Design a protein around this ligand. Structure first.
Ligand SMILES: Cc1cc2nc3c(=O)[nH]c(=O)nc-3n(C[C@H](O)[C@H](O)[C@H](O)COP(=O)(O)OP(=O)(O)OC[C@H]3O[C@@H](n4cnc5c(N)ncnc54)[C@H](O)[C@@H]3O)c2cc1C
Ligand SMILES: Cc1cc2nc3c(=O)[nH]c(=O)nc-3n(C[C@H](O)[C@H](O)[C@H](O)COP(=O)(O)OP(=O)(O)OC[C@H]3O[C@@H](n4cnc5c(N)ncnc54)[C@H](O)[C@@H]3O)c2cc1C
Lengths: 340, 340
């Protein structure tokens, strides 16, 4: 049939690929089209630090924990292939430093070799007295998106540069099903008082010698409002801010300083690092991910809509699990229409 | 007095700086000259992989077990300094993969977070059934030599490009003490059957996405006759050859393929790595490191000679603990000769 996906970030292209991948063989014309106002370099996904790591706190809707676990194994299974890196995927080991002892996270068994830090190791970070170590995966937002768009292109999925004004618009257009993957920018399509922006800023730097990631935590100031250093495919992401309710899209020198001096006390060799860029992004902060089916009708119309947005600061980390879900709900639409 | 150090590799320059730091403030005129027929870019130390790791096999002269540990505490103690990376030092984590279980190494507790690989992680390396994981350090020999030469230069230590034909030649040159740090070429100045070269070849590639080190072991081929991938400051080192008794300084086309094919089977993503260099060096293969005193009376002369060579594949790994040793034997001399 005719499927339209609004959104070209990790969640949108991920959901698309997954859908076409599992139903193209049964559906006659399966017309999948992606609409989005901004693409690749300009999505929230490219500004991502590119690390697999759910929050240190448990989620409401434990259904999100299984989605994180799914993504990990999907990505881990490519850690074999010769094209893993072209996808923006690669293994990394690192630390999560704390000022006081905290309980283990619920994902301690999802990652590789998680263990508490020994005394010697903490002497490398005098400012912290507690912490963990483990190996995870790197999913460079920028590169992963190019790969996803390429995989789709070959499958016949078409890309349109357009800012959808409302569902009806796409509906009239002729979409039988609509996949809403518009991140923090939802609301504009349908009001959602629960979906707010979580402004984050990062500095891109050239420190090829930094091979391990380091995330620090200030349990008083909130998650990611503490300096972190995350190496990527060929640049290191320096970060430290998470401001809720802030729609300011411009780099703030006020934050520039916090991140830089915060990261330079943590890793003094950064004084030689060369800044390659500074970007700002809005995490789709929502008390819970919205992933459900909704029936919107317009007289003789009756269009189908499936949502999948509001993944806060764990979009890359949970993307695939969420995608499998949508595909599953998409399967129940065909069933309801007698399509198998 | 006059101390003449023969050898400008990691063992010579280190011993040089160690002697200076400890006795400079006491001996009236402390002359220190370093002679070498080949410098930095061209020493065996510049061809090193850079990993801090002794052989898996138990040692001989448990004396080496402590020189290794000293050297590690020396290097680790630089991880907080802003000059760590400019010395060629940075932390790395990695794997040691085997085809069958083997006893733990004696240095297991010398490094950080040592542990055995689990089933999941093994599925990442299909050809191996056992392994360890631990964090260590990179001591890029290249950077380290330039770093030491600068530190020595600001200290008054003069360098001389001169090939030493005999110890006598130097004892007559006007030198009271001699530190023999001539590497695999020591025998040329005093026959030594126990010493032989351990030729090895290595491929320098550009694969910045590789963050961890991978070392495979083929128990039936000896040591480092299995591939290994060691990420460096800004280039990655491919390797896997150990040929004792071979003195060819040129690259063997076959050895190139044993390394390349083997590392690609281990790490598929290499197919897109752009080779940057290939080198060949000879490890100072000796059943035991030779660090000892040897008076050499040359008619009235009487020069003291201290030997520090034959470190095979663990020169960088054990350098500092040896220099600390030369400095003490030198203390003795200083005392007997009664300059203190
Ligand atoms: C600084 C920073 C670092 C981060 N680091 C990490 C990390 O390490 N790991 C992690 O998992 N997560 C991280 N995140 C969060 C992660 O980036 C997000 O969860 C993820 O990008 C959300 O994906 P998305 O689908 O919302 O897509 P987005 O890319 O945000 O948006 C997809 C598309 O929606 C389109 N769109 C929106 N409105 C409309 C409209 N009206 N019409 C048409 N198209 C529209 C956009 O044009 C866009 O292309 C980070 C976030 C920030 C800000
Ligand atoms: C491929 C490869 C990889 C390696 N990887 C590692 C690793 O990861 N970790 C590790 O710890 N070790 C490694 N090693 C071993 C390490 O490189 C050696 O143990 C170390 O370089 C030995 O130092 P050296 O003191 O012998 O110095 P070298 O640099 O070999 O020699 C020092 C000096 O001796 C001078 N010299 C010799 N004879 C004379 C003479 N007659 N007159 C004047 N000057 C003379 C030379 O000119 C030179 O400047 C590796 C070796 C190889 C070949």
């Amino acid at each position: 049939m005719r499927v339209v996906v609004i959104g070209a970030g990790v969640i949108g292209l991920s959901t698309a690929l997954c859908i076409h991948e599992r139903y193209h063989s049964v559906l006659q014309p399966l017309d999948v089209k992606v609409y989005a106002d901004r693409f690749t370099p300009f999505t929230t996904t490219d500004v991502a630090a590119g690390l697999w790591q759910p929050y240190t706190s448990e989620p409401s809707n434990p259904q999100e924990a299984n989605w994180n676990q799914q993504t990990f194994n999907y990505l881990l299974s490519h850690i074999g292939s010769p094209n893993a890196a072209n996808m923006g995927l690669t293994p990394v080991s690192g630390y999560n430093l704390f000022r006081e002892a905290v309980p283990d996270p619920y994902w301690k068994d999802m990652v590789l070799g998680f263990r508490k830090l020994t005394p010697r190791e903490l002497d490398m970070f005098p400012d912290y007295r507690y912490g963990w170590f483990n190996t995870s995966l790197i999913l460079e937002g920028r590169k992963y998106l190019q790969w996803l768009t390429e995989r789709l292109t070959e499958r016949g999925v078409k890309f349109f540069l357009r800012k959808v004004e409302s569902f009806e618009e796409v509906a009239r257009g002729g979409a039988d099903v609509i996949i809403n993957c518009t991140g923090v920018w939802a609301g504009v399509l349908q009001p959602d008082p629960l979906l707010q922006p979580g402004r984050g800023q990062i500095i891109k730097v050239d420190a090829p010698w930094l091979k391990n990631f380091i995330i620090t935590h200030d349990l008083e100031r909130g998650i990611y409002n503490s300096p972190y250093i995350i190496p990527g495919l060929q640049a290191v992401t320096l970060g430290g801010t998470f401001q809720v309710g802030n729609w300011n899209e411009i780099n703030n020198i006020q934050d520039h300083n916090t991140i830089w001096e915060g990261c330079c006390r943590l890793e003094p060799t950064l004084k030689d690092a060369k800044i390659v860029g500074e970007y700002t992004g809005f995490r789709p902060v929502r008390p819970q991910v919205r992933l459900e089916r909704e029936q919107l009708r317009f007289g003789s119309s009756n269009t189908e809509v499936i949502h999948n947005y509001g993944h806060g600061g764990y979009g890359l980390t949970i993307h695939w699990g969420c995608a499998l879900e949508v595909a599953k709900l998409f399967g129940k639409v065909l069933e309801e229409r007698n399509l198998l």
